[PDB]
């Protein structure tokens, strides 16, 4: 954390300033009441909103003038890494768990490959929401998690 918060970084302010002037420059050729003008003014308003949020959410900045992320585990920045991540692992786990629920449903059947190239959508729709409680995979792990043959 050898950095300075973005709220109080001159370089971070110079970037917002320089960016807006560039978009405003383009604003000149199109005159006022105009489609491009409204499009550029919308980018400018989207630009201000962006920088505003970064400062607002206490993100440090580097001498470069750009925010940098802390992933150490520090509590002030869970938003930077840890919070989104857990969110990921939830979804990743969801997808994988549902995907594995399908293969087991498919495995003891006729031609199993037939449903791997042509999806059983009724079956899939039945199993998709099981991923919602996928971290109760843990309780499968206490018993039938993985194969004993290997």
């Amino acid at each position: 954390s050898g950095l300075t918060p973005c709220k109080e970084s001159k370089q971070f302010a110079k970037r917002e300033k320089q960016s807006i002037k560039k978009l405003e420059s383009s604003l000149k050729i199109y005159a006022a009441d105009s489609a491009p003008a409204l499009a550029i003014n919308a980018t400018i308003e989207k630009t201000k909103r962006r920088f505003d949020n970064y400062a607002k959410q206490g993100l440090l900045c580097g001498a470069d003038g750009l925010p940098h992320l802390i992933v150490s585990g520090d509590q002030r920045h869970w938003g930077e890494f840890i919070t989104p991540g857990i969110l990921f692992l939830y979804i990743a786990g969801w997808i994988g768990w549902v995907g594995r629920s399908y293969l087991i449903a498919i495995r003891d059947e006729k031609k199993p490959t037939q449903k791997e190239i042509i999806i059983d959508v009724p079956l899939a729709s039945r199993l998709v929401f099981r991923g919602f409680s996928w971290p109760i995979a843990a309780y499968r792990e206490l018993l039938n998690g993985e194969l004993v043959a290997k």
Partner: protein
Amino acid sequence: EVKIILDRDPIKTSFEQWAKPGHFSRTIAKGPDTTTWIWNLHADAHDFDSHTSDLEEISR
């Protein structure tokens, strides 16, 4: 000889064969056992003279 317009009447129209991947080839219409099946399906898709040996069918 005399040149003229020659045609034949309806020769089938159904979604039945859409539901059956690799129908055009007798080897590959049985379905996949390995992932090689999938690649072969796209590589022999336009090989018409590999599908049948009748010149009339290939031409059509």
